[PDB]
């Protein structure tokens, strides 16, 4: 019973038919159909060999569509016919057609509304777009339409950024340029978005609060509520998805200057001009919008499942991920789904033979993911004082595959050397490296930008579950999954009705072998984190990075000398402290190494687990008071990527455009200060403790 | 080498040396006799025993008198004749006459000005006053000078009080009805407050903030400080205190209304009249401030003495209490600070013969906690990430007598127990209970109100260095002091020049057996504390505490029976989390009984430990973010005083008097539900933990 007996006791037939199971029908959080899931889950992870297997329920703010007012988008002429109307629904797939409940493409928490104007091209709507658009070329978003193609960054960002452009309305579109690999077919025949395709997904600016009528505390029966004026993320403009004919047939007549430049140009054959509005012939014809959705606080379930641990059951290792999915869920999140469930019966299958492991594991099926990581947020909401206190480690579970190339894992500094150990243990499955490890051909196929024989690993932001865990908790967290060699952007299929069980059977992984490769990092990660005697984190990787991320940031801050001269900016303090915690990590990994005494074990074990949860701040960072990590945030510009030292990222950008610069430049030293703090404390939490 | 052998150590005779060798010279916050003594403290715990001694120095906001520019008060007249002057010094004490370096009366971080105008009287300027004068007797307070009483409430509330009124300034005396003690002599001939007597201290409002310039963070070398225009809780308006000969000169003249009634009149041979201004014939006569006053950033010093524990040195029982004073200290802080030192030589003795406790306790020496806690605060906050995962209790040791009658405890509910058994083997110093214990002469002379054979022990607030660990950081904390048979008031002398080592050995504690029983109690909790195998909490009895708070907070809700139909708010959820609370702590409490294993002892004492943390809201209290304790916060009426379920007491104080009531019981209501939350929240980590 060792983790060999774990891993090989996992099985790609297994992988698959659950993956068939979960993808029949559509699981919409808030469903019948999805509360009709978790009971199965519930039952089977019982029949599995759990300790126990609970399904915990929360009311939260939810978004549909009207189911007898459709949303759509028209080209209306100067008596107002509606010359050209958007699509309804997507065409469903081969042998679906008669397949209900399939909910239309919608952007979920959109205000209703009718908006009608002129429009403007904003390309990815980046906040770098709207500095070009606005700053450069002069022109003026305010009572416009805009449309943007989906890409680079998260949806929400886009929302935020035309809102704040003053925008009366936002269309966002799938560009080929973006969604149609050259020389794949298209949805049946290939792994391509198809015309009639369209990107489902919520355009909510949520910051980490998880329901936005209850930020800071569980949405459970006796919650107070926010009145939905103060409800926290919600857009203040109709926003509505379409696909590329449709795409084609607004963009086509647009007039005003041209495109400022080629990257701005997607792959439709038309000129991509910026507007506003339509060429002199079609001057008179306005954009219309028809949003009708509605917000409704709605119930959901999440499953969690308890392997109670024999020797430290008050230390937690959780492995969790969403089981709510927009349509069928073929990729997200099934493939993840079925992982899991594939996870929980090899665990299972050796508790059932007298093993547990030294700690808990405690296993989560969340539910609204999709709607914000509701599930996830509101449950950590609810458990927030086990967590921090008993907490070990977060590996998130969503999509197993997002592509067949390589290995893409982000996840704390305090987990590399547990990731590099483990995949070179663990088999290829990449064809022509059979017989080599893991490791060999992820380093070979993703290399490290900084170092020579080493893979990349990215950093942590937001955009899934282990949010809350990482970025509010400071609960170390990893996630690994197989993907493409548009790393922001999604696979093509990304949240349509095309994404199916067929679509990965066919095109993705037919022998179910990345599915079983992740599943052995995913649980084998899991295993060592529960069982491993001493944890098996590294604190001198967080040292290694800390200096990487000062430097950046110093170098960040030097574009501006002349300003560092007049207003004093010293970066001293920060490289004191990432020195010092170099120094003491140094010193604690000597004693890790040097130290039958097991008081003096649950010691260090402590001084490792709440390393992590030295890094938060309880005042969290400016004006995002749920994201309290000091090292990592979510990007204000983008919740899908990580960004390091963000205070004082957030602090010098843009600075020079600031209209008071002896504030900016003082707002900047306060970040400074918080960050050399927080490094020397967390150091401090390393030294001997009496 | 037990608990005998400890408290056998301790000598009243070393406390009385102690004492007199802390009293010669004044030691204020800041000055250089003040680090002298720091750096006699440090190496007399260094001989003592200890195992490390440090100096944990930090730069904050003080304030002190113009040396060269004196404050005080006038009546001008209306050609600008100044024709009454209050004082500029207290006439010193017989023997200190030429003592230098006595700072002269004032009120600490009041700003600079010279305001003139008509007095009001608004007895103790409590909120109450305040609503007598503005509501009942129609006077306006706005642009006048106030005169306020001291007593019943912190100062700090009281101008707070008069600013919101709108006063141009406030002077504060102390009247002999509060002061003044009947059948007693004046110092230096018994214990009573003389005519020229004044008490000097602070009158900040900073919420538990620490240093005004760096909340959140500590002030060391590379803090970013806030401008003064933004410093955390300095007075607007100047203030000076004064003693009962100068108020009344200031009061005899008084005019317009008469006292609205006798709780209202002090004893001075005056009408107490409320004012606005003078009589008829001085009516022309105005009062005159001139404050001088100036803050500065200025070092201040704690000093830190660690005995590391044999067993589990990551666990830290800490017992602290301040060494600055205003003046000589001869009871405030000394008399504590001298049962410290005391407390400290024991412990080194046992352990000099191979002796050390179970767990680490550290003992802390703190600075400018006279200027508002600030040396305590600075320290938490350097060192919270370690104080919030390895606190076990705090024990504070401000003052040990204000009087002679009997024993005074405040503490968490948890060390209830521990009170009740340790004071039942400790004898009473009492006349008349020789050969009693403790426990059966201050529960004879301090019942309990609610229960039969049953002592009164307090709810903690603040007003002394346990605030940050407890109400910021959730640290079990408890204090115990001989007291009087007033409790808010201060003894007569408090503060002044007056307070000696001489007033303490003629007047108080010849003694010293007070002294030693106030070191017995305070050792003797931290003894137990340090070295019992399970921690000496009971859970069940927080249960008891908790229904009696929600009983009282339903009552005060009970006095608006319509608007509690009109706006449906029930009480029903914090009901059932107490009633859960009860039910799984009293399996708890079976557990802890029915328990060899040590890592099950680590995971008990873990849960007991964290479970006072587990009443810590992150988000703070509405307005106040650094009391975070849900159940306990200082009353925002008087710092000194604790209120239970202090966010919807805030909630519901006064509120028939709010315009907009919908808004107002919302936020009743939204209270219920975090108190509720954070209730059942705190018994879930009593449960099982898997
Ligand atoms: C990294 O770790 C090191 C410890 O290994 C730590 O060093 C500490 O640095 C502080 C700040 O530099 C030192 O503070 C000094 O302390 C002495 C007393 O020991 C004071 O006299 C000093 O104050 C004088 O000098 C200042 C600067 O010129 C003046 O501004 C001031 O008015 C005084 O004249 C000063 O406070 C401290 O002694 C060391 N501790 C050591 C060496 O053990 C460093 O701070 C760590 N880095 C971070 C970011 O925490
Ligand atoms: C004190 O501890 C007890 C547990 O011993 C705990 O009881 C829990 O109370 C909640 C709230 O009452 C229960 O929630 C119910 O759960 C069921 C499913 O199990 C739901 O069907 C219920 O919802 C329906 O009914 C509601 C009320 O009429 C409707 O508003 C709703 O729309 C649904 O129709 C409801 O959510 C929960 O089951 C129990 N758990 C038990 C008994 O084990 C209680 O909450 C604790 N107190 C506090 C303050 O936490
Ligand atoms: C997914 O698999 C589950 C579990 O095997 C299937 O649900 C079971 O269906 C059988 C036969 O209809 C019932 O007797 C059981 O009660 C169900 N078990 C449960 C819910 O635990 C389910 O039919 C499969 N779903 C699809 C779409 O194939
Ligand atoms: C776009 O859809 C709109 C709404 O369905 C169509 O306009 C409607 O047409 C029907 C039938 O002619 C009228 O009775 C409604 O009053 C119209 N409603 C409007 C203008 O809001 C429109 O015909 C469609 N356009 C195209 C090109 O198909
Ligand atoms: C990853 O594996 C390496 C190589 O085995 C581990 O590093 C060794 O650990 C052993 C056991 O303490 C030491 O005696 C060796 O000196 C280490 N070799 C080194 C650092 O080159 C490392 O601990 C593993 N990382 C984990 C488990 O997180
Ligand atoms: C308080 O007691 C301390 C310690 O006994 C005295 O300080 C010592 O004074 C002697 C003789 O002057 C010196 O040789 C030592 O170096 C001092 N020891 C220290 C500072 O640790 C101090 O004199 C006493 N203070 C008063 C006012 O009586
Ligand atoms: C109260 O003190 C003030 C200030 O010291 C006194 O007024 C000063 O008196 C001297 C000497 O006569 C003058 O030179 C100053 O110009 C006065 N300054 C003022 C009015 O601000 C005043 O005499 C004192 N009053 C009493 C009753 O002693
Ligand atoms: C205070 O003392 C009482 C009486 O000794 C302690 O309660 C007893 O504890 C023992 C040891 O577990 C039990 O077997 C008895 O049944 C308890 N007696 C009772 C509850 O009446 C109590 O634990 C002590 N409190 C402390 C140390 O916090
Ligand atoms: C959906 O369609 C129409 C719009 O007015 C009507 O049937 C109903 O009000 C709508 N339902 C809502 C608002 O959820
Ligand atoms: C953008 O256009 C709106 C239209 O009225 C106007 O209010 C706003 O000032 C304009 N901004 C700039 C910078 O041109
Ligand atoms: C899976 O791998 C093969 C090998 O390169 C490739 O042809 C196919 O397109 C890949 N699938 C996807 C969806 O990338
Ligand atoms: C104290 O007295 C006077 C007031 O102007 C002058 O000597 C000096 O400025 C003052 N010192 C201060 C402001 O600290
Ligand atoms: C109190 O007096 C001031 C004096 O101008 C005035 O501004 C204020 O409105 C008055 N308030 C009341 C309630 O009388
Ligand atoms: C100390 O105790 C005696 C006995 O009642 C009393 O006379 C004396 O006033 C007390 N001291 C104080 C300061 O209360
Ligand atoms: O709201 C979020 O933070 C992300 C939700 C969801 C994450 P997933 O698509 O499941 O990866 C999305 O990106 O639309
Ligand atoms: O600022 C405070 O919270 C209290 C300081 C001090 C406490 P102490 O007099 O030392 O009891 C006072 O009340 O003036
Ligand atoms: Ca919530
Ligand atoms: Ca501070
Ligand atoms: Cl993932
Ligand atoms: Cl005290
Ligand atoms: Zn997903
Ligand atoms: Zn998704
Ligand atoms: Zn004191
Ligand atoms: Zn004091």
């Given at each position: 019973?060792?983790?060999?007996?774990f891993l090989?006791?996992?099985?790609?037939?297994?992988?698959?038919?659950?993956?068939?199971?979960?993808?029949?029908?559509?699981?919409?959080?808030?469903?019948?159909?999805?509360?009709?899931?978790?009971?199965?889950?519930?039952?089977q992870?019982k029949?599995?060999?759990?300790?126990?297997?609970?399904?915990?329920?929360?009311?939260?703010?939810?978004?549909?569509?009207?189911?007898?007012?459709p949303?759509?988008?028209?080209?209306?002429?100067?008596?107002?016919?509606?010359?050209?109307?958007?699509?309804?629904?997507?065409?469903?797939?081969p042998?679906?057609?008669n397949?209900?409940?399939?909910?239309?493409?919608?952007?979920?928490?959109?205000?209703?509304?009718?908006?009608?104007?002129?429009?403007?091209?904003?390309?990815?709507?980046?906040?770098?777009?709207?500095?070009?658009?606005?700053?450069?070329?002069?022109?003026?978003?305010?009572?416009?339409?805009?449309?943007?193609?989906?890409?680079?960054?998260?949806?929400?960002?886009?929302?935020?950024?035309?809102?704040?452009?003053?925008?009366?309305?936002?269309?966002?579109?799938?560009?080929?340029?973006?969604?149609?690999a050259?020389?794949?077919?298209?949805?049946?025949?290939?792994?391509?978005?198809?015309?009639?395709?369209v990107?489902?997904?919520?355009?909510?600016?949520?910051?980490?609060?998880?329901?936005?009528?209850?930020?800071?505390?569980?949405?459970?029966?006796?919650?107070?509520?926010?009145?939905?004026?103060?409800?926290?993320?919600?857009?203040?403009?109709?926003?509505?998805?379409?696909?590329?004919?449709?795409?084609?047939?607004?963009?086509?007549?647009?007039?005003?200057?041209?495109?400022?430049?080629?990257?701005?140009?997607?792959?439709?054959?038309?000129?991509?001009?910026?507007?506003?509005?339509?060429?002199?012939?079609?001057?008179?014809?306005?954009?219309?919008?028809?949003?009708?959705?509605?917000?409704?606080?709605?119930?959901?379930?999440?499953?969690?499942?308890?392997?109670?641990?024999?020797?430290?059951?008050d230390?937690?290792?959780?492995?969790?991920?969403?089981?709510?999915?927009?349509?069928?869920?073929?990729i997200?999140?099934?493939?993840?789904?079925?992982?899991?469930?594939?996870?929980?019966?090899?665990?299972?299958?050796?508790?059932?033979?007298?093993?547990?492991?030294?700690?808990?594991?405690?296993?989560?099926?969340?539910?609204?993911?999709?709607?914000?990581?509701?599930?996830?947020?509101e449950?950590?909401?609810?458990?927030?004082?086990?967590?921090?206190?008993?907490?070990?480690?977060y590996?998130?579970?969503?999509?197993?595959?997002?592509?067949?190339?390589?290995?893409?894992?982000?996840?704390?500094?305090l987990?590399?050397?547990?990731?590099?150990?483990?995949?070179?243990?663990?088999?290829?499955?990449?064809?022509?490296?059979?017989?080599?490890?893991?490791?060999?051909?992820?380093?070979?196929?993703?290399?490290?930008?900084?170092?020579?024989?080493?893979?990349?690993?990215?950093?942590?932001?937001?955009?899934?579950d282990?949010?809350?865990?990482?970025?509010?908790?400071?609960?170390?967290?990893?996630?690994?999954?197989?993907?493409?060699?548009?790393?922001?952007?999604?696979?093509?299929?990304?949240?349509?009705?095309?994404?199916?069980?067929?679509?990965?059977?066919?095109?993705?992984?037919?022998?179910?072998?990345?599915?079983?490769?992740?599943?052995?990092?995913?649980?084998?990660?899991?295993?060592?984190?529960?069982?491993?005697?001493?944890?098996?984190?590294?604190?001198?990787?967080?040292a290694?990075?800390?200096?990487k991320?000062?430097?950046?940031?110093?170098?960040?801050?030097?574009?501006?000398?002349?300003?560092?001269?007049?207003?004093?900016v010293?970066?001293?303090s920060?490289?004191?402290?990432?020195?010092?915690?170099?120094?003491?990590?140094?010193?604690?990994?000597?004693?890790?190494?040097?130290?039958?005494?097991?008081?003096?074990?649950?010691?260090?074990?402590?001084?490792?687990?709440?390393?992590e949860?030295?890094?938060?701040?309880?005042?969290?960072?400016?004006?995002r008071?749920?994201?309290?990590?000091?090292?990592?945030?979510?990007?204000?510009?983008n919740?899908?990527?990580?960004?390091?030292?963000?205070?004082?990222?957030?602090?010098?950008?843009?600075?020079?455009?600031?209209?008071?610069?002896?504030?900016?430049?003082?707002?900047?030293?306060?970040?400074?200060?918080?960050?050399?703090?927080?490094?020397?404390?967390?150091?401090?939490?390393?030294?001997?403790?009496?």
């Open positions: 019973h060792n983790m060999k007996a090989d006791e996992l099985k790609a037939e297994n992988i698959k038919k659950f993956l068939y199971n979960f993808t029949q029908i559509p699981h919409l959080a808030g469903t019948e159909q999805n509360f009709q899931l978790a009971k199965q889950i519930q039952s992870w029949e599995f060999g759990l300790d126990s297997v609970e399904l915990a329920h929360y009311d939260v703010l939810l978004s549909y569509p009207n189911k007898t007012h949303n759509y988008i028209s080209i209306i002429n100067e008596d107002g016919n509606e010359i050209f109307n958007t699509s309804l629904f997507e065409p469903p797939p042998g679906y057609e397949v209900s409940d399939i909910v239309p493409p919608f952007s979920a928490f959109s205000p209703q509304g009718m908006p009608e104007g002129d429009l403007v091209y904003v390309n990815y709507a980046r906040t770098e777009d709207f500095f070009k658009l606005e700053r450069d070329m002069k022109i003026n978003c305010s009572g416009k339409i805009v449309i943007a193609r989906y890409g680079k960054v998260f949806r929400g960002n886009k929302v935020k950024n035309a809102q704040l452009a003053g925008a009366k309305g936002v269309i966002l579109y799938s560009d080929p340029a973006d969604y149609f050259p020389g794949v077919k298209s949805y049946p025949d290939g792994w391509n978005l198809p015309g009639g395709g990107q489902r997904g919520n355009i909510l600016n949520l910051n980490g609060a998880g329901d936005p009528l209850t930020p800071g505390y569980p949405a459970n029966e006796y919650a107070y509520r926010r009145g939905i004026a103060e409800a926290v993320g919600l857009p203040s403009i109709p926003v509505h998805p379409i696909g590329y004919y449709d795409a084609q047939k607004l963009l086509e007549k647009m007039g005003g200057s041209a495109p400022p430049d080629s990257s701005w140009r997607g792959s439709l054959k038309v000129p991509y001009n910026v507007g506003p509005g339509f060429t002199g012939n079609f001057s008179t014809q306005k954009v219309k919008m028809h949003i009708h959705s509605t917000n409704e606080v709605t119930r959901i379930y999440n499953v969690i499942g308890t392997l109670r641990g024999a020797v430290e059951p230390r937690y290792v959780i492995l969790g991920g969403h089981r709510d999915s927009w349509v069928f869920g073929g997200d999140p099934q493939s993840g789904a079925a992982v899991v469930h594939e996870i929980v019966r090899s665990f299972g299958t050796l508790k059932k033979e007298g093993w547990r492991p030294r700690r808990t594991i405690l296993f989560a099926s969340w539910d609204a993911e999709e709607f914000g990581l509701l599930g996830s947020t449950w950590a909401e609810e458990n927030s004082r086990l967590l921090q206190e008993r907490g070990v480690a590996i998130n579970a969503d999509s197993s595959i997002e592509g067949n190339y390589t290995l893409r894992v982000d996840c704390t500094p987990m590399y050397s547990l990731v590099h150990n483990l995949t070179k243990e663990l088999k290829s499955p990449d064809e022509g490296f059979e017989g080599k490890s893991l490791y060999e051909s992820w380093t070979k196929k993703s290399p490290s930008p900084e170092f020579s024989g080493m893979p990349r690993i990215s950093k942590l932001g937001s955009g899934n282990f949010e809350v865990f990482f970025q509010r908790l400071g609960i170390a967290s990893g996630r690994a999954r197989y993907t493409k060699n548009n790393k922001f952007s999604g696979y093509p299929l990304y949240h349509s009705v095309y994404e199916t069980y067929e679509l990965v059977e066919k095109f993705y992984d037919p022998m179910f072998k990345y599915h079983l490769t992740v599943a052995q990092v995913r649980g084998g990660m899991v295993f060592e984190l529960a069982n491993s005697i001493v944890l098996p984190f590294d604190c001198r990787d967080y290694v990075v800390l200096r991320y000062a430097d950046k940031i110093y170098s960040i801050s030097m574009k501006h000398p002349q300003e560092m001269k007049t207003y004093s010293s970066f001293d920060l490289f004191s402290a990432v020195k010092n915690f170099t120094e003491i990590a140094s010193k604690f990994s000597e004693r890790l190494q040097d130290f039958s005494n097991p008081i003096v074990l649950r010691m260090m074990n402590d001084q490792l687990m709440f390393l949860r030295a890094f938060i701040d309880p005042l969290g960072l400016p004006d008071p749920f994201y309290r990590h000091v090292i990592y945030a979510p990007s204000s510009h919740k899908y990527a990580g960004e390091s030292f963000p205070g004082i990222y957030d602090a010098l950008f843009d600075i020079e455009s600031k209209v008071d610069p002896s504030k900016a430049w003082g707002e900047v030293k306060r970040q400074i200060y918080v960050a050399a703090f927080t490094v020397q404390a967390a150091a401090e939490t390393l030294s001997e403790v009496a």
